[PDB]
Short mmCIF file of C-alpha atoms and ligand atoms in Angstrom, two decimals:
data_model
loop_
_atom_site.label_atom_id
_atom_site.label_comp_id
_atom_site.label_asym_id
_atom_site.label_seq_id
_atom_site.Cartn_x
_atom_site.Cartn_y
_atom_site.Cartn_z
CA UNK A 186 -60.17 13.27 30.09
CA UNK A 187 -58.62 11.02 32.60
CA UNK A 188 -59.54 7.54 34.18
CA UNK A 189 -58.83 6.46 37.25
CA UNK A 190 -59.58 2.67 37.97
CA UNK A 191 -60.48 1.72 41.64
CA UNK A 192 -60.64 -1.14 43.31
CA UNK A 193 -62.01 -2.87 46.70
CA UNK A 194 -60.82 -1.11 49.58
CA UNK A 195 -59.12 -3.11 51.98
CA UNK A 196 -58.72 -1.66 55.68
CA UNK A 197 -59.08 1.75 53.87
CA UNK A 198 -56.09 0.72 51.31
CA UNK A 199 -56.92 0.64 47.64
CA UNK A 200 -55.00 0.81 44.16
CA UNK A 201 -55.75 3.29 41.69
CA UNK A 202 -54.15 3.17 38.24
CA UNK A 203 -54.25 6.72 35.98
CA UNK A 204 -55.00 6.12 31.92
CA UNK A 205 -54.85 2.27 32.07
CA UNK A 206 -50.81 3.12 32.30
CA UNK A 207 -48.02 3.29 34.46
CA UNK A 208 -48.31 7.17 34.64
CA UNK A 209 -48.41 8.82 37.90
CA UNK A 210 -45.35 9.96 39.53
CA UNK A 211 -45.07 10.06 43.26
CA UNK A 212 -46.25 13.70 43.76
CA UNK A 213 -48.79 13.32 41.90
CA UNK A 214 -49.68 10.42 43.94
CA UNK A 215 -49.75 12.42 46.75
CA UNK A 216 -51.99 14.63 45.08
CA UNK A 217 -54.36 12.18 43.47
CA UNK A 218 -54.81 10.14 47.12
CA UNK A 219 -55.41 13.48 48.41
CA UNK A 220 -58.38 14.18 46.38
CA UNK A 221 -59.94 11.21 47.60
CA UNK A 222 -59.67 12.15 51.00
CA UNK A 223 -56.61 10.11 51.26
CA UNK A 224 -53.22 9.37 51.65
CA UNK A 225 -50.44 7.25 50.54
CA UNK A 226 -50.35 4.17 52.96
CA UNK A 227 -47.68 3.54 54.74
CA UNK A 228 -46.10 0.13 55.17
CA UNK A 229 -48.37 -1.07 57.92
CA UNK A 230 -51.37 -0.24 56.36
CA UNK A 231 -50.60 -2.01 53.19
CA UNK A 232 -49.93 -4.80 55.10
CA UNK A 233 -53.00 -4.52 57.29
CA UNK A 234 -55.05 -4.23 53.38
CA UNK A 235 -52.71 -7.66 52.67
CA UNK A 236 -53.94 -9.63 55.74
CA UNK A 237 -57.51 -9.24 55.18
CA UNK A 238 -57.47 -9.90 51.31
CA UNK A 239 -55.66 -7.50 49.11
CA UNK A 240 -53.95 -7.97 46.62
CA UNK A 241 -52.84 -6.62 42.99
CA UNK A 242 -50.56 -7.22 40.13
CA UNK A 243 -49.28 -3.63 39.60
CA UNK A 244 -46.42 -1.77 41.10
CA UNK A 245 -47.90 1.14 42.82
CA UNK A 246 -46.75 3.88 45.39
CA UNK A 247 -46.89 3.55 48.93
CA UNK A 248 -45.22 5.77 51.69
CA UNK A 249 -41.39 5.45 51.10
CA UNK A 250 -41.63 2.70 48.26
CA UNK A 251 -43.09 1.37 45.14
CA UNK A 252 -45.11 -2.47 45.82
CA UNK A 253 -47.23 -4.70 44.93
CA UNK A 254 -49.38 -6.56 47.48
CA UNK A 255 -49.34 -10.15 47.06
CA UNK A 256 -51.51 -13.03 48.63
CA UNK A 257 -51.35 -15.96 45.87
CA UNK A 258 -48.17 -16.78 43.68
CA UNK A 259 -48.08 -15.62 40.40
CA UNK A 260 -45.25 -16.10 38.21
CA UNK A 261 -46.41 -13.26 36.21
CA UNK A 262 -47.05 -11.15 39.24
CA UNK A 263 -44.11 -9.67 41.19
CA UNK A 264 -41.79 -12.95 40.13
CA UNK A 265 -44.42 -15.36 42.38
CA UNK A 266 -43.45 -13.19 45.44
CA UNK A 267 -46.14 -13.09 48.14
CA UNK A 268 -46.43 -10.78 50.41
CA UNK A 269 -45.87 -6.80 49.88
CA UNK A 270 -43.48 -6.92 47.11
CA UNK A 271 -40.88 -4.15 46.87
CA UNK A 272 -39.80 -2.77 43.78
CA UNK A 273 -36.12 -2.72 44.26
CA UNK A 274 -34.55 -1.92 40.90
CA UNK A 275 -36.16 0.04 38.13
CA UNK A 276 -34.90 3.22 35.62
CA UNK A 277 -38.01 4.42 35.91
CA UNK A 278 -40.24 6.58 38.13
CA UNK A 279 -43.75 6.20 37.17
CA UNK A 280 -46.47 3.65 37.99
CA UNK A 281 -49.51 3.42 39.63
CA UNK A 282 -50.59 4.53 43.04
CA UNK A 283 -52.27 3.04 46.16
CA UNK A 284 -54.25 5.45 48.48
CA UNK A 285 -55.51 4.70 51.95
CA UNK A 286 -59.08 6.29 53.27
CA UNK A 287 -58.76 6.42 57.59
CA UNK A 288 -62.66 6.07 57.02
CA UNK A 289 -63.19 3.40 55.02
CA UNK A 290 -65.00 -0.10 56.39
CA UNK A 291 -62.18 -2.03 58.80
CA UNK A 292 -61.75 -5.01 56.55
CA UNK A 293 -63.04 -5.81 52.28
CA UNK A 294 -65.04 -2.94 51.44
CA UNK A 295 -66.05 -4.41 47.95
CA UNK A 296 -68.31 -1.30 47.36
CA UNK A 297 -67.80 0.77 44.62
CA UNK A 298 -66.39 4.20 44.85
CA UNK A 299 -68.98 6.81 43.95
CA UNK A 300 -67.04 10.36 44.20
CA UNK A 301 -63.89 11.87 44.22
CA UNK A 302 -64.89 14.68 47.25
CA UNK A 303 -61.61 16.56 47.41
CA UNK A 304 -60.70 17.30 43.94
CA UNK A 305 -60.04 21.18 42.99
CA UNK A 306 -62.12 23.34 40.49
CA UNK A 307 -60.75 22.56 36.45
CA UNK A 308 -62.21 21.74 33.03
CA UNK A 309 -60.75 18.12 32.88
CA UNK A 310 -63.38 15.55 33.09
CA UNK A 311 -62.01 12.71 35.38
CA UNK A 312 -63.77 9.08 35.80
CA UNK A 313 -63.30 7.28 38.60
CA UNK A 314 -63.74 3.84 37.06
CA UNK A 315 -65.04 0.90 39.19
CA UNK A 316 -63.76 -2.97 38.38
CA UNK A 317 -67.45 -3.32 37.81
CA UNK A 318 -67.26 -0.67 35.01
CA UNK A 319 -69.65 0.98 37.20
CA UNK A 320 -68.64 5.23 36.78
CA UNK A 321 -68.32 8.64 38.57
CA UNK A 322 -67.38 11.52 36.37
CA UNK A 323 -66.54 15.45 37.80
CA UNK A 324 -64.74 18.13 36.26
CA UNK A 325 -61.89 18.96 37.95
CA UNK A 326 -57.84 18.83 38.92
CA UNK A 327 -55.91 17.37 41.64
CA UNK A 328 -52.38 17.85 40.75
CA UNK A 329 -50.61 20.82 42.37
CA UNK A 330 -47.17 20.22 41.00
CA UNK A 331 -46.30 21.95 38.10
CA UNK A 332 -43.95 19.31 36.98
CA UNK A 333 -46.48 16.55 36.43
CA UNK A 334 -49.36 19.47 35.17
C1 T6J B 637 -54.10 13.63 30.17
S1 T6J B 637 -52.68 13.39 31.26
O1 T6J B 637 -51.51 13.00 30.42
O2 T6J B 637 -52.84 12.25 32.16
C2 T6J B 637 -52.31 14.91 32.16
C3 T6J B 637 -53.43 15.21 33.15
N1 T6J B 637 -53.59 14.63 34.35
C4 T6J B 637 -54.68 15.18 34.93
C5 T6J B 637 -55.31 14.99 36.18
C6 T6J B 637 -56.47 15.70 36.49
C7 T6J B 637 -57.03 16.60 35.59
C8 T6J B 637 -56.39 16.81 34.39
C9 T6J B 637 -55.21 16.09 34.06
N2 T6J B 637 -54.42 16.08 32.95
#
């Protein structure tokens, strides 16, 4: 079983975190926005998502880094940075991910997400997981590289 918790779109950007843990690595991040008809933003779009509201307290893949978007100081939350926040030094290479949906609404789409429409044929049930607590189950797979299957 795996959860995936969603939040707000914001200009099609949105963060997704795997198993309430830092746990996806960034092919399977690839995969995962993939299988929501997405893909990993890239720098402009995350700051687009920043400008008209977004923001989270978890490090999470984009296109060429690892951020967190930032609107209000928060001494717990990227050292009171604002702005998107680039993980510069870690060990470690797993955290969440942020996806990006071309089709989403232009600005806070604070709908929840009610499918996962690209996901492959498997026996694992996943749940897409709203910040409402409001859920979509399917059985089925997304990752494609062996090394995080
Ligand atoms: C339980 S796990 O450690 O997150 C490995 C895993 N990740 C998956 C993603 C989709 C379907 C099955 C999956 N099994």
């Amino acid at each position: 079983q795996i959860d995936l918790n969603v939040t707000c779109r914001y200009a099609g950007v949105f963060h997704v975190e795997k198993n309430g843990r830092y746990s996806i690595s960034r092919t399977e991040a690839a995969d995962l926005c993939q299988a929501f008809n997405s893909t990993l933003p890239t720098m402009d779009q995350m700051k687009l998502a920043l400008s008209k509201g977004f923001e989270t307290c978890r490090y999470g893949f984009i296109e060429g880094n690892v951020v967190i978007p930032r609107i209000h100081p928060n001494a717990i939350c990227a050292a009171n940075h604002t702005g998107v926040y680039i993980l510069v030094t870690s060990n470690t290479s797993h955290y969440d991910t942020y996806c990006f949906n071309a089709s989403a609404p232009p600005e806070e789409d604070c709908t929840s997400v009610t499918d996962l429409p690209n996901s492959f044929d498997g026996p694992v049930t996943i749940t897409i997981v709203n910040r409402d607590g409001t859920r979509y189950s399917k059985k089925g797979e997304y990752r494609t590289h062996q090394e995080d299957i």
